[PDB]
């Protein structure tokens, strides 16, 4: 609790950088520009619309506290991730192929570095004729 709130406050100190207490489009655009993430107005506004509920365009501090105090290790998260993985399933056998996932991850959706492709290839078991199950991945990422 105390460690959590201390970490949250020390993070928001860099996130906000002053006494305003609210984050604007430029406020986090500077953060992503420092990391070289190439922020865009459209994606930033879509993120803004993904937090607020009144449409005023400002992220309220109580809203941030409520949305962030809860954790991502929820019950429905496992089902949603399972369905998302099943979207890229062949014949419903519950496994993700090496070549299929290698093509899908880099090409479909947001592109991924081939370095991280070798990373997840070596992270999973190289045995099993190059076949890896994803249910354990959902289990380990749901509860972290």
């Amino acid at each position: 609790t105390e460690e959590q709130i201390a970490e949250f406050k020390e993070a928001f100190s860099l996130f906000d950088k002053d006494g305003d207490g609210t984050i604007t489009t430029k406020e986090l655009g500077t953060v992503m520009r420092s990391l070289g993430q190439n922020p865009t107005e459209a994606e930033l506004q879509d993120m803004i619309n993904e937090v607020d509920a009144d449409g005023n365009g400002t992220i309220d501090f109580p809203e941030f506290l409520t949305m962030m105090a809860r954790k991502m290790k929820d019950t429905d998260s496992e089902e949603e991730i399972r369905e998302a993985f099943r979207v890229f399933d062949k014949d419903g056998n519950g496994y993700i192929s090496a070549a299929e996932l290698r093509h899908v991850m880099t090409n479909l959706g947001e592109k991924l570095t081939d370095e991280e492709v070798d990373e997840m290839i070596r992270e999973a078991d190289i045995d099993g004729d190059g076949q890896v199950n994803y249910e354990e991945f959902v289990q380990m990422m749901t509860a972290k």
Binding site: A11, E80, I81, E83, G92, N93, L108, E135, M141
Partner: protein
């Protein structure tokens, strides 16, 4: 290699059992026939003339069913470990906690107790077996996953509730009026139209096209009224079947068109990539900030998946057209603004 083959055969058995597809259905069909046969034999055991050989055949088939069913139960429990959600002894217990698994095991135990009671052959045991020979149908009940047939029927009925209520209401009014008129014209000549309840029974049998013939109008005026009201009410009483059949066919066509497309692929890819980035994310405070940002993107991708859970429909294509039209129009507005600035 042993582990790989073990997991592969476990997955194959779990597929043919819990998630049938294609030729796997063959197996289920077989089991269905078996259950159906038992039911038929039970029906043939209530006939006093055929009870002997039917009871013997039911005993033999009950044994065969016990062996095959217990084998299926054991194989299903073993194959539950294909997915890590039910791996280990704790996972197998969690699998055994499923409502249909517990229904299957109580059905098995009831059948074993029935066999033991027949071995004892008590009078109370005989009554118990006669009462409990019906429990096998629960297996057939288990086939539709989570009551899919009931949910489909309820959805289609609710979608057409007003039409079905209209059909039944007008048909009931026609039934009442026609029965009353035929009763009035048939009171004195026909002994099977003595009371209005008899006329209502006749009208129900007639307008449903059952036509038992136990009650029929004998007077010619009664026959003319019966013919006219028969045409009307017969048209009215067959309406629900036509309404529901056409609704089912339209729903099938819409589902075919919807399935033809694909919507959730991009949100699924977004969820996978943001999950991967958040996993790989774990000055150190800046790295923690990046972790928080990745979890934030993960939540956004999850919300996008949740909102795209809804299937395609006419509003989706309409709004896609609206977005394309607006993009074209605004882009041409900018183009002509630039061109008039050039000319100006």
């Amino acid at each position: 290699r042993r582990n790989v083959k073990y997991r592969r055969v476990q997955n194959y058995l779990y597929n043919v059992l819990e998630r049938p597809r294609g030729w796997a259905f063959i197996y289920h069909a077989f089991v269905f026939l078996l259950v159906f046969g038992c039911l038929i034999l039970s029906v043939f055991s209530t006939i006093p003339e055929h009870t002997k050989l039917a009871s013997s055949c039911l005993l033999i088939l009950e044994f065969v069913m016990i062996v095959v069913f217990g084998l299926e139960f054991i194989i299903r429990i073993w194959s539950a470990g294909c997915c890590c959600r039910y791996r280990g002894w704790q996972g197998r217990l969690r699998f055994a906690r499923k409502p249909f698994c517990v229904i299957d095991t109580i059905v098995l135990i009831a059948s074993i107790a029935v066999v033991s009671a027949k071995t004892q052959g008590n009078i109370f045991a005989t009554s118990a077996l006669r009462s409990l020979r019906f429990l096998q149908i629960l297996r057939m009940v288990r086939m539709d996953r989570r009551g899919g047939t009931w949910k489909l029927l309820g959805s289609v009925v609710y979608a057409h509730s007003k039409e079905l209520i209209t059909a039944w209401y007008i048909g009931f009014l026609v039934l009442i009026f026609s029965s009353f008129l035929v009763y009035l014209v048939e009171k004195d000549a026909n002994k099977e139209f003595s009371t209005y309840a008899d006329a209502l029974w006749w009208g129900t049998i007639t307008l449903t096209t059952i036509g038992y013939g136990d009650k029929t109008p004998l007077t010619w005026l009664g026959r003319l009224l019966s013919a006219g009201f028969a045409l009307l009410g017969i048209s009215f009483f067959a309406l629900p079947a036509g309404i529901l059949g056409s609704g089912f066919a339209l729903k099938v066509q819409e589902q075919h068109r919807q399935k033809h497309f694909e919507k959730r692929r991009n949100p699924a890819a977004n969820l996978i990539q943001c999950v991967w980035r958040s996993y790989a994310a774990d000055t150190p405070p800046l790295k923690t900030v990046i972790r928080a940002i990745r979890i934030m993107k993960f939540h956004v991708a999850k919300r996008k998946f949740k909102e795209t859970l809804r299937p395609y429909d006419v509003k989706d294509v309409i709004e896609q057209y609206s977005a394309g039209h607006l993009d074209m129009l605004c882009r041409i507005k900018s183009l002509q603004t630039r061109v008039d600035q050039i000319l100006g």
